TrEMBL record:
It comes from the Viruses. This is Nucleotidyl transferase. InterPro entries: L544-like_helical (IPR048545), L544-like_NTransf (IPR048543). Residues 216-359 form the L544-like helical domain. Keywords: GTP-binding, Metal-binding, Nucleotide-binding, Transferase. Mg(2+) 2 binds at residues 49, 51, 196. Mg(2+) 1 binds at residue 49. GTP binds at residues 39, 48, 217, 226, 229, 260, 332. One of its GO terms (molecular function) is transferase activity. The gene is mchi_656.
């Protein structure tokens, strides 16, 4: 005979967010007017974020979306327990890549600051031959220029400045669009957790948006040869096969789930930082939790871990937060590299079970 932590899914957690959090961050909190999507709907053990769609039409439409959003943002800014990092709505069509011709990309590059002009140039050279791969990493670089992203300050003010001294108006933007994305952060457990709320204030079908989001994730993973994330499209393809689905879900969410969570948590650090919602206490707690859970990655070694602990001795809060941010970017790629190496064997195991004619839509050779 013989005898805190990272956020884990419990039904208790879900009941809390639905009854205590959702009534504060949704426009129409009625359970029949919102749908939980993504990994939280699948109740994955290592909670990453929570993705929700609020279908508010017709009670909220283009007629009153502006007033409703202004009211929502004002309520959030008054709540010390809920953070609204960004509000995404609208596009800057000056940064739309349609043809991919040399002058189109030239005109776009001119609008950028010098440091972004260089990075733009590097992508052009590196992928001189692969047109599609060139255009993808170009869109990756000009992403935040093309897709308008608003701080609460920008929303309440009513406008914000874009590149080349062009101003954009918020009311004008939302009244000529159909959806708004709200990126929240809420205390869930021992650190802030992201909640993405999509407001759908037209009666439009979001199906082409989901299909497009799925295709984007496929390209992102494949073009970077991130074999772990390259498993995600396979989860779609085998959703009818019970045995393969269970194994893929286990590999992604259970076997390597903590790798994904740590990557999200590091990203959340960066997002909270650049959005201006990161104080030294919050940043320190996150780094502590990350250092703790890094030790739970079997066989993971990193020189960054020492550098991070070394910085913590400093007294200046701004220096620590900035240095941590730089170091965590490196740690992110180390975690990314580690999980992609471990997952390579599983990707090829299951892509080989895909009929040759269907490999093109699940894999970029
Ligand atoms: N580097 C990298 N990260 C990825 C890729 N695909 C997904 N991720 C990360 O995985 C996270 C999403 O994982 P989950 O939230 O568990 O899955 P999900 O809810 O279906 O995905 P979202 O709709 O993005 O929240 C994102 O926040 C990304 O940080 C990829 O191709 N490359
Ligand atoms: Mg998610
Ligand atoms: Mg999300
Ligand atoms: Na707030």
């Amino acid at each position: 005979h013989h005898s805190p932590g990272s956020l884990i899914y419990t039904y208790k957690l879900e009941k809390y967010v639905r009854t205590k959090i959702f009534p504060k961050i949704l426009l129409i909190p009625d359970k029949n007017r919102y749908i939980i999507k993504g990994s939280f709907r699948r109740r994955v053990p290592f909670v990453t974020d929570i993705d929700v769609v609020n279908n508010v039409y017709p009670e909220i439409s283009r007629e009153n979306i502006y007033d409703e959003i202004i009211k929502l943002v004002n309520n959030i800014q008054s709540d010390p327990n809920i953070i609204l990092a960004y509000l995404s709505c609208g596009t800057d069509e000056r940064f739309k890549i349609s043809t991919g011709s040399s002058k189109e990309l030239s005109n776009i590059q001119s609008l950028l600051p010098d440091n972004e002009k260089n990075e733009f140039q590097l992508v052009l050279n590196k992928y001189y031959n692969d047109q599609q791969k060139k255009l993808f990493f170009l869109n990756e670089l000009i992403w935040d220029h093309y897709k308008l992203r608003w701080k609460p300050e920008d929303v309440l003010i009513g406008s914000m400045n874009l590149a080349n001294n062009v101003s954009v108006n918020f009311r004008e933007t939302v009244e000529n669009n159909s959806t708004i994305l709200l990126q929240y952060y809420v205390k869930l457990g021992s650190y802030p957790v992201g909640i993405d709320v999509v407001i759908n204030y037209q009666k439009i079908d979001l199906t082409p948006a989901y299909k497009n989001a799925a295709l984007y994730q496929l390209q992102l993973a494949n073009y970077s040869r991130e074999y772990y994330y390259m498993l995600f499209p396979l989860r779609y393809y085998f959703k009818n096969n019970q045995d393969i689905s269970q194994r893929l879900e286990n590999i992604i969410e259970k076997k390597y789930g903590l790798y994904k969570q740590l990557m999200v948590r590091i990203d959340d650090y960066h997002t909270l930082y650049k959005s201006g919602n990161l104080k030294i206490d919050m940043a320190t707690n996150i780094v502590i939790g990350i250092l703790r859970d890094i030790e739970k990655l079997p066989g993971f070694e990193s020189d960054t871990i020492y550098q991070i602990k070394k910085v913590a001795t400093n007294n200046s809060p701004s220096i620590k937060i900035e240095e941590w941010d730089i170091l965590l970017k490196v740690l992110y790629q180390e975690i990314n590299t580690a999980v992609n190496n471990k997952s390579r064997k599983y990707f090829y195991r299951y892509i080989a079970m895909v009929p040759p004619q269907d490999r093109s839509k699940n894999y970029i050779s």
